[PDB]
Subunit: 116 residues, 4 copies
């Protein structure tokens, strides 16, 4: 609920299904510790990554495995992945949706941040 | 259900609320006849524009009133509106979502088309 | 030149070459009158559309024939065309670049307005 | 030059000027080693990062310091930075332009790869 990832495919005009997503959180020693991971559904959405308790203040990295997506579809894309890096929950809990729109040589990403 | 419009604001990181949307359909004489209109909700979504019966094959124009949106927020933007023009239902009924991501001098639009 | 149009292809990662572009100016009766046109070059650019003298304040529409571009590449696209509609304003900077990034079911456009 | 980076501002409709850009090359041990850096010019461009000799095949990361850019304009942004990660491949065209379009809560990036 606190963190959701939606992915769309600009070539097909569809949700981007079965996209692997890995989330990391910056540790006190400045390394990127694994936080959560999952795959987008048939709707292009990934829910259930974390809980309000576990999703504390910090710097998070959402890595969307765009190359693995395009290669699973038999296409040779430009980027390795799309990375979204942001400070979260620094003014108390918020709900974050990270959205991405994918093409083989381009991608756009935006955030929708709401206060419960 | 057959036609939905979602609008997001890239400056605020939020849904774009209260955005006026006008839909037109090309008539047999090549003019743009009014088809439907409405405003985005607090979620940035506009539902209820049309029915499966009324939404026949044709060329449709979805005009998103981006200038009126930015000016209602006291901002002077570049574009008059964003226009999305497409042939619909030419291989039988489909469900269309027209999405747009807005900035004062830029916007992206994509379609998600599904077969029920 | 006061107005440049640049078109890019997000599928191939290249300029979008030989794309037809039509520019219209809004007339007093709210109809769109032909203003300038051309085809993008090998660099995806279209220069020479107008001059400082002719490009007066007003509402302009740049129509990019995206459907023909995709069909020539053997790809089925969503949109009939991409349209960019804006007001030219003398108080702002002098030079307008209208950029468009094309995919089969999506496009993005931005304006880069400089002196 | 084999590698150009161009940064644009979607709020003001302008080049994004004086933005710090850092380029890294992936090392054999999977760490990111500094490769080239600079600040975008008045045209939002950063030329001169590398040469044909130095820009061998491999995985590169271009990090754009978007947070500092927005803060200097007095705007609160979402991202820490924008990152563009890609493989340089000799079979493809020779010249890579990495373009980024910035908004406070969003960015877009494309690659224009030509000969
Ligand atoms: O959950 S619904 O709103 F119903 O269906 C939708 C869910 C999500 C989206 C959506 N979210 N972001 C976008 C989206 C994101 C980017 Cl970077 C973009 O360039 C464009 Cl044109 C759209 O679309 C659009 C529709
Ligand atoms: O010599 S170059 O600077 F490379 O030629 C170029 C000139 C302009 C652009 C360019 N300007 N805006 C964009 C561009 C525009 C849109 Cl809507 C966008 O989504 C993205 Cl990711 C980039 O690309 C890219 C290349």
């Amino acid at each position: 609920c606190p963190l959701m990832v939606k992915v769309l495919d600009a070539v097909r005009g569809s949700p981007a299904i079965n996209v692997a997503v890995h989330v990391f959180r910056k540790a006190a020693d400045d390394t990127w510790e694994p936080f959560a991971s999952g795959k987008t559904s048939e709707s292009g959405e990934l829910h259930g990554l974390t809980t309000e308790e576990e999703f504390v203040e910090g710097i998070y990295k959402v890595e969307i495995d765009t190359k693995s997506y395009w290669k699973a579809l038999g296409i040779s894309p430009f980027h390795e992945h799309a990375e979204v890096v942001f400070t979260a929950n620094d003014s108390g809990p918020r709900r974050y949706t990270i959205a991405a729109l994918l093409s083989p040589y381009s991608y756009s990403t935006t955030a929708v941040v709401t206060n419960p």
